[PDB]
Write an enzyme that holds these catalytic residues in place. Structure first.
Site, PDB file in Angstrom:
ATOM      1  N   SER A  11       0.828  -1.244   0.000  1.00 62.13           N
ATOM      2  CA  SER A  11       0.000   0.000   0.000  1.00 62.13           C
ATOM      3  C   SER A  11       0.838   1.260   0.000  1.00 62.13           C
ATOM      4  O   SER A  11       1.679   1.426  -0.861  1.00 62.13           O
ATOM      5  CB  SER A  11      -0.970   0.072   1.163  1.00 62.13           C
ATOM      6  OG  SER A  11      -2.043  -0.673   0.875  1.00 62.13           O
ATOM      7  N   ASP A  70      -8.259  -5.487  -7.020  1.00 68.15           N
ATOM      8  CA  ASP A  70      -7.895  -4.473  -6.058  1.00 68.15           C
ATOM      9  C   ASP A  70      -8.473  -3.148  -6.564  1.00 68.15           C
ATOM     10  O   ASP A  70      -8.058  -2.622  -7.567  1.00 68.15           O
ATOM     11  CB  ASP A  70      -6.369  -4.365  -5.977  1.00 68.15           C
ATOM     12  CG  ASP A  70      -5.885  -3.509  -4.847  1.00 68.15           C
ATOM     13  OD1 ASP A  70      -6.656  -2.673  -4.344  1.00 68.15           O
ATOM     14  OD2 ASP A  70      -4.695  -3.669  -4.489  1.00 68.15           O
ATOM     15  N   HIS A  81      -7.362  -5.871  -2.294  1.00 66.20           N
ATOM     16  CA  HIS A  81      -6.170  -5.194  -1.832  1.00 66.20           C
ATOM     17  C   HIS A  81      -5.297  -5.991  -0.834  1.00 66.20           C
ATOM     18  O   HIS A  81      -4.168  -5.591  -0.505  1.00 66.20           O
ATOM     19  CB  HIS A  81      -6.604  -3.872  -1.240  1.00 66.20           C
ATOM     20  CG  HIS A  81      -5.475  -2.915  -1.015  1.00 66.20           C
ATOM     21  ND1 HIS A  81      -4.520  -2.641  -1.980  1.00 66.20           N
ATOM     22  CD2 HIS A  81      -5.158  -2.156   0.055  1.00 66.20           C
ATOM     23  CE1 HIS A  81      -3.666  -1.766  -1.503  1.00 66.20           C
ATOM     24  NE2 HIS A  81      -4.055  -1.430  -0.292  1.00 66.20           N
TER      25      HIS A  81
END
Lengths: 278, 283, 279, 279, 279, 280
Positions: E144, E230, E259
């Site tokens: 991330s 995602d 994700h």
């Protein structure tokens, strides 16, 4: 959200099935035919006046005693046509077909190897009711039921026509990449956590894919599809429909989600079966 | 916004819940006068046999005069049975005739009426008269029935119709407006709230006007036997609104309570309970 | 969802503040007063016809040059009452209400609360420096975050003469957090979900900015509003600040409204309130 | 946000229990039936990328003799006897690094409830059969479905010495169902929405698996945790079990957390608890 | 599946946007912060951990500010160990994976991007300064926001030797914003909704922090991961960075994941990748 | 986020139109029927706290002679003649409509099946035009959403209107809207058709009489449109269909990052500018 209609009508994806697809099913049915069917009909207490209701017991998968309902409309006729309807609720939830002059055999799915085998046997059970006209035995289902019916259209000696609404169990690999809804999302949620099992999940599901039964089914059929159905997306239904090897028609509901054609499609079925059986 | 599970008064308290009623001094004059106005036109019920794929049931397209003489529509479904006189359920909602197979299949003629509330309640009172005018209908066994908006309508009819003999009232809407509005953010009660959000000065007049249509106020007047149903997780028609009406209901009565159901109510289970209730009533 | 109305009207929870609440604010304002305000008003080219518009610059927190709009209605009067309105500052034409009712309007661009509150106290001084503003009729106003800010200013500004406080945020933090899961109060909750050991410090820090603690100090007359279905700024939080508010006061209660409050109906109430006050 | 009973009342919450006259006979008999098969634990050393831990694929007899699987993770420490946590859920062995890293052998069992509880009781017996395990320091642990299972095992296992029960599922079914519309308790509701006539039988059947009823019987020390905003396992359900729990006990209360509970903070609380207990 | 199909993602090389001073900006930023001595300080911490030693680390980052980190060292024979600098700081026990696999782990507390990237470059220098760290085997890692940071660091750090970049944020902004309405990319959109005139400046400013532009410069070996479902970090954004990435590289594609990416499966892929790389 | 055709293609998007052979006879006849009753505009000065604006309660005859209500807001300015914006929408408070008067325009705000509403709206222009201070050469019609749809129809039906401000309009390209969005208000059509599966032809033929595209093709007055490229109430392909068919001199302001809020306050200023350039 799915392919446009021009393209849905021409949609014929590559099929995936194992070299033993037929040996697997022939063997499954043979194993379960080794037990006698032994259908038993018990009249049941009902407040219904236009219909007689039976609790039916019969041998399904591996000889297990399964049950279904049999709903017979009270009519002069000594022989009646019959709809084997796959899903339960109450007997009074299944009033449509009897009210249209068909005997109705209602079987709940109580894994798919067991359910499909039970369902094949349910047709044999229905057929064994003396009032049933064997030339006019119909198999029907919507959703999971439509998927089950579709399989039965390829596996049952006795079935004569198919009513397949908004079927589930069709074109698994494509469903999974189009919608995040139950039931197809169970597959996705399994694969999210078992990242190494993609080949085996899809090879296994290929034995239960409606597209693969459709290619084999030879009886006449009426399909229905909702172009806004995001439970059973249109490309999945059209894949099965287009591979379906028997005489066929599809009713297309462009503004409907998974409800499909609903009551309108019910009348279309009656009309279809009337034209078919004259 | 939907409540998670139980969100209204507990059951011990719902059963004793009798809030203060609000109605205008002219509640009765208003409805007498409304019905008199619409009775000045002849009912003129017309029944047309319809071509139908149905085999157990005969179907009629019905036309009759409702509110201010306007020609309203309904279906009549008659089960094919030896009996020269049949009991009859007037059911308030019109889709296909085949959607209304339940009551005919249980041996009742079914009058289905196609559905401001001044007009709808008057139409509905007249639908009973239309149904009663079918020669095969037994007038001693005319039942009025509805769920949701239909239930609210039926409830009003239980107080306004000379001809109706029993009420089936499921998960009724149109009940106990002032309380509904402070419990749920769901349609249809939330239309009232959204109105008031914008017309902050019209609280008295909105509630005084709605009082003329409140099922609680009809319930207090209704003298015929009735079977109610309620879902304790119903956040369209919350339980305290249904219990208010049920508890004020002045005829012989029973309620079926479905603790785990939302607005579906008792569904098919409750359909059987109605058959049983009506059988016991009319034998 | 909150306490019933009979109880909201009597709701006076225990307050929490640190021993230096007053020293902290005195000291904060003194530090920022050591820079000259230096208000600068620039007439702007505007399509507006009933109003003149100024781009305002003034010194706020620690001498930083903050921006505002000033909207002056074209009226005979040599001296006009003024509303300092807190919120960014969008277009001049977004602020037409008060000028259209005969009030000069000073709209401050917001930019942590130490800074914003200081900026806001200085905005009143900026507005007071405009020669057409009547200093006896300077009003402070805000809704939401603005209302919270205005409430603080009602306790910190020498120059402000009345408060309009609608559906105020920044009020009774510890109760808010246990009633609603909405933004903005839910930021506190989400912080604490992760920083489980920081409850004391979060709440003590927030006590310096809590509207209830300013309300207890504020002496100027005020009109509050509250929505009884407001789940952003729940009623018990607004009533806590309202009930503690130490000046002459009134509240308008909107029983069917969420955070929109009394909306346009309340805007008229404010005009009426200020008219009655300033005669 | 907060939707259940307040904390004052949760701490005193002791609802009437429902169990059948044969609750004990049912479980005694179930365990006896499964003990008629030898355990036959098999430990297979696994090839692993792990350097601080040794990993075993464990096979043992559970319910009715079926061969169940688990992981055994052993930290490389120069001690001949180690304490052990039997942890109920199986992912990768590297997902279970917490307890081994804190010096505990970790038995992770891959997980109708008749079968699962019996499998879980037998997993303790499998773990105890590892020669490096100190049988005086066998702990049983779970969160959610795992916490429910652990709670049952605290009453059914001869061998277990302490319980770590976080945000347990399988507690106080009748109440859960009337508070929350979330999975998993909503499966019960969705069943009853459709089988309106099966309320009595559903709840009588579930009474054999209710953590409250096991809690009343469990005599070993335990540390519970609860989230006061947990709408999967609502606080009144956890507190019913906790309050009926008949061994020495403590609860860690996380007021701002949902079903994540105390998370990593709680993990350290457990380490501390077990350290104080085992000295 | 909502983005480009996989056949097209693999060939996706959109036009890059950067300012003429991209390199001058970063050179100058790092030079400014190198003017303060790193002054790494490692404090052994009291810990219940048994397989790992834990240090509280302090070091100078952006502009000399004292940043914090954890150092986790697995108790092993070896006098020199490989090291993963991981970007996100919770509890030390949250970071057991890499130490359990035989790597020293430097976990940096993330606190705008000018400051965070500079902090992150300096974290590598802090980790390298631990005497037990093998400077030929320093790895940088993140998922991330962490992946986006790691990606930048792969182009900015003299001392980093390999990159693990999972589901990175901070990549191909202009495209992200037109595919997803999710946080964090939706903060850009919400800004632009309101500041309609600031499109050029928002994107020109963000170009300095875009992972695609760092990727084009990074020369060290790397393993990327992507989730084809995602919708936080859409696959076309990750593939843009991956495809421009100028060092030896591989990507692991997870077609059914959102994700979370490859999760624990991907963690093992990293161990494998690094093993093959370093021997 | 972005879910419709790309911009390059929106700009060229000209779908086939459908209308009945009597489209014009229907509207000519509808307006004639309602003109047979006298407009009889009545302006009542209202007690208002406003100081820069005078407010009138307006009553006038609309559809089939029914007495419709509106507000008239007149800014207090020297000028004997003022330009006027007829704004279509609660008509809420008079203070909600301060923008146009503040910019020097008289504002007629009309309190708003479509047969009735469009006819009412055409008559509102006549009501506004009857105020002696209104300059009839500078009467503008304006609306956003349902209002923008209504204004668009008025641009083709009103003898008196001189310019159009059409923002994020509803009532445009019905058959496409219904297949792109599941939002209200277009979803009321879809929900009707879900249930009345046999009424597709009649639904769309009937709606053709009210479709902004078909009015656009007829409208000859100058106009400023706005569109939000993330608008999933009034999707961009519906607004561009109307805009592109619009037969008068025109411009469009495109807001790529906005949903149904459109250009908001930025667009308001664009309108002022547009009307200023137009009326000199």
């Amino acid at each position: 959200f799915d392919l446009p209609l021009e393209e849905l009508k021409k949609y014929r994806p590559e099929r995936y099935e194992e070299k033993d697809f037929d040996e697997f099913w022939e063997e499954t049915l043979a194993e379960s035919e080794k037990f006698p069917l032994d259908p038993v009909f018990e009249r049941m207490e009902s407040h219904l006046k236009t219909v007689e209701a039976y609790d039916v017991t019969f041998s399904g998968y591996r000889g297990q005693r399964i049950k279904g309902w049999l709903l017979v409309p009270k009519l002069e006729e000594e022989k009646l046509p019959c709809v084997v309807q796959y899903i339960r609720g109450f007997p009074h939830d299944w009033l449509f077909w009897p009210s249209m002059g068909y005997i109705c055999f209602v079987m709940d799915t109580r894994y798919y190897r067991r359910v499909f085998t039970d369902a094949v046997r349910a047709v044999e059970a229905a057929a064994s009711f003396p009032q049933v006209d064997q030339e006019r035995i119909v198999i029907a289902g919507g959703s999971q039921g439509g998927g089950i019916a579709l399989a039965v259209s390829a596996l049952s000696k006795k079935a004569k026509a198919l009513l397949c609404d908004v079927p589930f169990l069709c074109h698994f690999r494509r469903a999974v990449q189009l919608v995040d809804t139950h039931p197809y999302a169970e597959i996705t949620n399994f694969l999210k956590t078992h990242r190494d099992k993609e080949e085996i999940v899809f090879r296994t599901l290929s034995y239960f894919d409606g597209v693969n039964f459709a290619a084999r089914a030879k009886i006449p059929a009426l399909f229905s599809v909702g172009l806004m159905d995001n439970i059973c997306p249109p490309s999945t239904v059209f894949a099965a429909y287009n591979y379906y090897a028997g005489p066929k028609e599809i009713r297309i509901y462009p503004y409907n989600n998974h409800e499909g054609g609903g009551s309108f499609q019910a009348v279309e079925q009656v009309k279809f079966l009337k034209k078919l059986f004259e």
